[PDB]
Amino acid sequence: AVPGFDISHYQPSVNYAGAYNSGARFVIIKATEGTTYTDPVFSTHYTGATKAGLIRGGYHFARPASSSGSAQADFFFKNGGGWSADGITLPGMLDMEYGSTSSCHGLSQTAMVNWISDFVNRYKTLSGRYPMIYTGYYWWVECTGNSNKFATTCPLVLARYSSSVGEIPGGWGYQTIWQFNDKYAYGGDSDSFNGSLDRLKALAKGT
């Protein structure tokens, strides 16, 4: 496994080099939310991560009631979700979260799958590759009907704050990344990539 973490403007200051020296090899950084919000610390975190030798990518906090998935993929891509095969860039991550007022943001399971499809496919044409999908197990089960539509295309980032990853939703074989606590020492959440640093480098390169 390879250690990493994820951060946002909730961590205004991060010791990127200390994280690397402690064993972190990647970081996932909030870029955008909905149609209108850019995380003000994105560029600070992305620059610091780069110079410290962390592999890094951005994430988009989905707000499916606010706009189409296509519109949010365009916004993400333009504001930190870009990807190239430079060797140090993760595919962008689509962050599916419980809603402000209801778990599934007022969408039916089929509407939610359609909304994610539009995000995922728009991101693919813009970047060249499918995004990662972040979810918890019960969120995916209730909000998508435990959809398997993305299981062969989008790497799974599975959140479960336990000693074990637990059941894998959606017909994915396995999670690519496990978010296993919300208490990373340098700030933000703790992540673990499933496999070795060479396998992680291959994920970033898109080989």
Numbering used by the authors: 1 to 207
From the primary publication:
Muramidases (N-acetylmuramide glycanhydrolases), also known as lysozymes, cleave the bacterial cell wall peptidoglycan component at the β-1,4-glycosidic bond between N-acetylmuramic acid (NAM) and N-acetylglucosamine (NAG) in the carbohydrate backbone. The characterized enzymes from GH25 exhibit both β-1,4-N-acetyl- and β-1,4-N,6-O-diacetylmuramidase activities, cleaving the β-1,4-glycosidic bond between N-acetylmuramic acid (NAM) and N-acetylglucosamine (NAG) moieties in the carbohydrate backbone of bacterial peptidoglycan. The first half of the barrel, where the active site residues are located, is a classical barrel which is consistent with the idea that the initial ancient fold was a half-barrel which became an eight stranded barrel by gene duplication, with more sequence conservation in the half that contains the catalytic residue and less sequence (and as seen here structure) conservation in the other half which is responsible for binding specific targets. It is proposed that, as previously suggested for other GH25 muramidases, that Asp95 acts as an acid donating a proton to the glycosidic oxygen of the substrate, with the N-acetyl group of the substrate rather than a second protein carboxylate acting as the enzymatic nucleophile to stabilise the oxocarbenium ion-like transition state.
